[PDB]
Design a protein around this ligand. Structure first.
Ligand SMILES: NC(=O)c1ccc[n+]([C@@H]2O[C@H](COP(=O)([O-])OP(=O)(O)OC[C@H]3O[C@@H](n4cnc5c(N)ncnc54)[C@H](OP(=O)(O)O)[C@@H]3O)[C@@H](O)[C@H]2O)c1
Ligand SMILES: NC(=O)c1ccc[n+]([C@@H]2O[C@H](COP(=O)([O-])OP(=O)(O)OC[C@H]3O[C@@H](n4cnc5c(N)ncnc54)[C@H](OP(=O)(O)O)[C@@H]3O)[C@@H](O)[C@H]2O)c1
Lengths: 287, 300
């Protein structure tokens, strides 16, 4: 099976490295047919990017005919393109999608997932929320339960900050978005809670419906009625108390119980492992 | 598909109820063919147990010919029986197993899982560790990652007793409350003396680290009134233990209080912690139900 790798920054390079470490027997048949950046299309799996052709992700898609697209490109919160149009075309063609790019999902979740479900196409999106720490995929192992509310710390960069020296270290460590105002001004946290509300609660929201601010903890919240992101004081008994540094946490409340998962919120290798986890699950037919 | 339900105490009853809530489309073809207690065999799905036949779990297996056994019976750490021999017969007959009963897996994990792998039979065992809080099933969504070490509070009953004693309640009243809530093992010495926690860390070491250990390999102690102290379980590639330890304020496990449990899993990629209710009949039954749905999805 052939992957098209869309993006080759820190996450894309880390993903290619993880694939080549041969971490699961069911990835033995998986090859990268092509890699696309802003600089063009490489129709080969190489450690170093050198373009073979000029052209965008649609040209690469037509040239390669991939079985799966792995989207690790920059978030475009303006309109989610070209990923939004690309996912739609891939789903129509029966091409599975694995993504760490929040933007098309933060803007158009219902449109994308409705189309996928109607076509029997699978979407892996673990890396969009808390990188490699099961979040999306945690919910996959909570079947037959109704999610009532969601609460968490969903942005790694800003939690690591909690100024100029802090950010600089975070950018050095690769935690930050290419546009780091997306981290600071809360877009990233709001995108993640949007994705979580859609998937787990079923509350069809876009990032436009979320009330949010920026950088006590930056708390993202969703229930059946509302979705928001705001700073709040935290109790000592509250399980979010000492989720500090790059750490992120997701508290899922159901009809049965409340559970919390905590882990590294950001980090290119962690994000890439999220996408890799989705790939293994796809291969097992468990997405 | 037909289930044989082995046991009908708090967990079994809660499981039956959850199945009847029809919580997933995967479960539409799933029926209980029989329920076994130490009072005999009920060849019917009913809220209250009344035996139709006298006989043990083996006789029930023969009479029902189930597609799946759900083991919610009492732990037997002396020898894991009759569950251990039952699992071996089931696997050989192509019968899948879902269990919340730790004993056979704490004694003979490699034997059971080797036999199962060879026959292509699936084993759900989420409920053996932290009830309905993904633990076993959390590791299922961490594929292609090597587990280096694990540390946690793995017994709800003793955590609940430690917390209440910190709140100035006697050990004796804290235990009675744990029992009233249905947190405790039928034999509460299994919780108190650390057997239950040791069983769980054994299972995790086997499943996640891949070392073929048994409960006899674990150095463990439990709790008493004489001792924040937390009953800490730990495993890595070289050692497995359970002991009550003083816990500092900055430790992620400091505020894991009451019946809450928590597991920190360190992989080659990352360190993660999951926390939630350690015990509770409905929580345990939900663990088993989660395994059932995953089994139907072919994702065990
Ligand atoms: N950083 C983290 O820790 C983390 C954790 C979870 C999720 N994520 C998500 O993962 C994604 C990638 O993160 P990253 O840190 O790897 O960013 P990055 O290092 O800037 O990589 C972005 C890659 O996408 C390519 N790209 C961007 N826009 C494109 C376009 N219009 N056409 C073709 N290629 C394009 C870039 O090409 P050039 O090489 O030519 O610039 C670059 O190779 C982001 O969406 C982010 O939100 C990141
Ligand atoms: N307590 C929790 O919240 C929790 C959480 C996770 C896992 N678990 C595990 O789940 C299991 C069941 O828990 P529970 O609270 O439901 O215990 P329980 O209330 O004591 O129920 C045990 C059931 O098994 C039956 N049984 C025991 N030995 C048997 C034998 N040799 N043959 C036939 N039937 C037998 C009992 O029959 P009678 O009714 O006739 O006595 C009873 O119906 C235990 O292994 C426990 O470790 C419990």
């Amino acid at each position: 099976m052939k992957l098209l790798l869309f993006g080759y920054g820190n996450v894309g390079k880390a993903f290619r490295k993880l694939l080549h470490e041969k971490r699961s027997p069911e990835l033995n048949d998986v090859i990268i047919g092509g890699i696309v950046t802003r600089r063009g299309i490489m129709l080969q799996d190489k450690e170093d990017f050198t373009p073979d052709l000029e052209g965008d992700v649609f040209k690469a898609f037509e040239k390669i005919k991939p079985d799966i697209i792995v989207d690790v490109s920059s978030a475009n919160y303006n309109n989610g393109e070209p990923s939004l149009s690309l996912y739609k075309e891939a789903i129509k063609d029966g091409v599975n999608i694995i993504t760490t790019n929040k933007a098309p999902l933060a803007l158009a979740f219902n449109e994308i997932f409705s189309l996928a479900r109607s076509k029997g196409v699978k979407i892996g999106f673990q890396g969009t929320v808390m990188s490699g720490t099961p979040s999306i995929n945690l919910y996959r192992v909570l079947p037959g339960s109704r999610v009532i509310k969601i609460r968490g710390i969903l942005n790694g960069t800003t939690n690591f900050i909690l100024f100029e020296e802090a950010l600089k270290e975070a950018q050095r460590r690769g935690y930050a978005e290419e546009d780091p105002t997306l981290d600071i001004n809360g877009f990233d946290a709001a995108a993640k809670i949007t994705i979580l509300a859609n998937f787990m609660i079923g509350n069809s929201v876009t990032i436009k419906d979320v009330k949010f601010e920026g950088i006590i903890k930056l708390i993202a919240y969703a229930d059946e009625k509302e979705v928001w992101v705001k700073p709040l004081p935290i109790s000592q008994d509250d399980p979010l108390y000492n989720v500090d540094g790059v750490e992120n946490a997701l508290e899922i409340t159901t009809d049965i119980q409340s559970i919390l998962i905590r882990g590294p919120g950001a980090g290119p290798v962690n994000a890439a492992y999220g996408a890799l986890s989705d790939l293994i699950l796809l291969k097992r037919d468990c997405l």
